[PDB]
């Protein structure tokens, strides 16, 4: 995240991180036993850590569970990032408290100049690399679909949207892929790609979740 702010220890319970030696992507809790991250985030060998705020220190409210199952989206396509998105199911269920919760999904879309809570322990800096122990926050708005096309000429789907700042210095980043985008306390994004980090007319794009639910719900009930 550049731009942003410590966000608190577990103040974001649903957040978690990906690691495979080391953290790679984040993604979100969506109950006791399944994740939701980004098809681009797919690795065999996955952990999942709960509860986490610094991720190079064992501070007492961890949960470190591997993956059993990862089902990436049947139309992920990687040269677009169209669909970007996957679950992973977790080879024993989470114990949920305050600390570690799941968030809710949508009911309905979210529209422009919604404002949004963006987390991740990606890189925090627009020029050159500098890498959190621990998590960061954003607060950005649901940008237009005008103004994300504008932005993005001939690359956004229905599948995508734009969040952040036109005028740049404040976005997500590498290595904050797969984590949540969420607002009016519901998981609308997760986060896909950008042009740099943080650049002006650049904004960061969002996985919309609001169009995978029926295929989440779906996915879950059967496996
Ligand atoms: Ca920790």
Known sequence: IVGGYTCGANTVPYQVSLNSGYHFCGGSLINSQWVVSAAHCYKSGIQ????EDNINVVEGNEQFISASKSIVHPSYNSNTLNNDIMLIKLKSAASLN????????????????????????????????????????????????????????????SNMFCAGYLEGGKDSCQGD???????????????????????????????????????????????
Do not use: E, F, M
């Open 48 to 51: 999942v850590r709960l509860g």
């Open 98 to 157: 305050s600390r570690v919760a799941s968030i809710s999904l949508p009911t309905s879309c979210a529209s422009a100049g919604t404002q949004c809570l963006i987390s991740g322990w990606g890189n925090t800096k627009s020029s050159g690399t500098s890498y959190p122990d621990v998590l960061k926050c954003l607060k950005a708005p649901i940008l237009s679909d005008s103004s994300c096309k504008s932005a993005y000429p001939g690359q956004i789907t």
């Open 177 to 223: 892929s797969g984590g949540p985008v969420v607002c009016s306390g519901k998981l609308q994004g997760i986060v896909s790609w950008g042009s740099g980090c943080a650049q002006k007319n650049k904004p960061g794009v969002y996985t919309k979740v609001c169009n995978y639910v029926s295929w989440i719900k779906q996915t879950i009930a059967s496996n």
